[PDB]
Ligand binder design. Structure first.
Ligand SMILES: O=c1ccn([C@@H]2O[C@H](COP(=O)(O)OP(=O)(O)O)[C@@H](O)[C@H]2O)c(=O)[nH]1
Length: 434
């Protein structure tokens, strides 16, 4: 097997939407014959028992922490508090097995791994877990400031169709200058690696593919969708599947806003009443930590909601999302348009309604609704009226046919001969050549 005898160390950023593709990549590479060490902070640490073919080294992260505000601060804090323990753990790993790490594969957001890799003389490959389209925005961010797109709504960003100003990637309560600093750091430490892995396919990116290559001085591998590649479900996850088994085919709206976005009580109430008033069956994930600054207890739902929706809805703290999405009862997906959830909806043929919040979410949601046209976007603060219109519109009536095509195209790119199967074999060769 091609990689046997080659030790790769993969470094995810410690949140689920980053851990998940890094470890899909990990399992894929292990199946190509590599030995895989994951190094991870204790923060949101994955379960080793779900990845029995991977070796796990857990490091102290020196920290709770809010994930929906002050995002540049949090992400700089993750880099900083983990850096010294990472350095010492990598050095101990080399010393403790002089019998050698071939490569470091690092989340693009962990820009601290560049200095670490240079000091250890190790080659780096950067994994970008956001949408490849969003990279184009990050790369030309100061140019978008130049042309007066930023700061600040529906004006077409002509350089980046179909994006509007309001779709450009950003973080709450954050100035253009802070955005330019941060994005330029991630862009630079991606461009300084030996290669960049993108979690998408040649076909999904066809409209921008030439442009993408030109924004990187280094080779690019389109190995996704990586989700197309556990050992025990929690109580909340297993109830998801048992409840769906009772529901009519394609009748369920699955609702989940990822692992890190946040809401206040009032937005959650509008969600809830919009959901209830739409009268659609729904599986709603309200993760611990979604709702901030409230004084009420999980699931923070308005009084009367459970009563009005008994029989129609199921509320949980976590869902086995990928199994939920291929489940025959699931007919739509209200997402925040995180890239993993976008891909997972595409791979499952499930039309989506998008309420993006920050980062590439706003890019992805516009792509879902305008470019791939496999779903719709809620524009805006959530308001129950507009939400119910969106949910009834999603679950009624074509979009499904385009979603079916996209799904089939994703199946074909990952099998033998597919562009992503090819691209992963070139990646393996790039790794072996280092
Ligand atoms: O109840 C949930 C919610 C999310 N996810 C997974 O968490 C990840 C979230 O990544 P995404 O890019 O969608 O958003 P992020 O969480 O990074 O904002 C995806 O792989 C989802 O399948 C899950 O397994 N269960």
């Amino acid at each position: 097997e091609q990689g046997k005898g080659s030790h790769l160390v993969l470094l995810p950023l410690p949140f689920q939407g980053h851990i998940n593709p890094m470890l899909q990549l990990a399992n894929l590479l292990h199946s190509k014959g590599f030995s895989i060490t994951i190094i991870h902070p204790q923060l949101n640490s994955p379960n080793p028992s779900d990845y029995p073919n991977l070796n796990f080294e857990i490091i102290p992260d020196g920290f709770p922490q809010r994930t929906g505000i002050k995002i540049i601060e949090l992400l700089s804090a993750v880099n900083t508090n983990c850096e010294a323990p990472l350095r010492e753990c990598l050095a101990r790993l080399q010393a403790a097995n002089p019998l050698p790490i071939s490569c470091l594969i690092t989340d693009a957001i962990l820009y601290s791994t560049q200095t670490i890799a240079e000091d250890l003389g190790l080659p780096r490959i950067v994994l970008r877990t956001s949408s490849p389209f969003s990279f184009l925005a990050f790369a030309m961010y100061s140019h978008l400031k130049a042309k007066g797109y930023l700061p600040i709504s529906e004006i077409s960003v002509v350089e980046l169709p179909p994006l509007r100003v309001k779709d450009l990637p950003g973080y709450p309560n954050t100035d253009v200058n802070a955005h330019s600093q941060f994005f330029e750091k991630i862009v630079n430490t991606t461009r300084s690696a030996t290669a960049v892995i993108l979690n998408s396919s040649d076909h999904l990116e066809r409209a921008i593919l030439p442009e993408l290559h030109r924004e990187f001085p280094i080779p690019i591998f389109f190995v996704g969708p990586l989700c197309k590649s556990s050992n025990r479900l929690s109580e909340n996850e297993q109830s998801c599947l048992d409840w769906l088994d009772k529901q009519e085919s394609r009748s369920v709206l699955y609702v989940s806003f990822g692992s890190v976005t946040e809401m206040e009580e009032a937005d959650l109430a509008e969600t809830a009443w919009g959901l209830a008033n739409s009268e659609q069956p729904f599986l709603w994930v309200i993760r611990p930590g979604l709702v901030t600054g409230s004084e009420r207890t999980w699931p923070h739902l308005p009084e009367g909601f459970a009563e009005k929706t008994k029989g129609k809805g199921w509320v949980v703290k976590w869902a086995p999302q990928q199994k939920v999405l291929v489940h025959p009862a699931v007919g739509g997906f209200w997402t925040h348009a995180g890239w993993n959830s976008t891909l997972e909806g595409i791979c499952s043929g499930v039309p989506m309604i998008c309420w993006p919040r920050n980062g590439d979410q706003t890019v992805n949601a516009r792509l879902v609704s305008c470019s791939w046209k496999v779903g719709l976007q809620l524009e805006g603060r959530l308001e129950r009226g507009e939400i119910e219109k969106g949910l009834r519109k999603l679950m009624a009536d074509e979009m499904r046919e385009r979603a079916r095509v996209l799904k089939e195209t994703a199946e074909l790119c990952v099998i033998k001969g597919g562009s992503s199967y090819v691209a992963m074999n070139k990646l393996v060769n790039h790794i072996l050549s280092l």
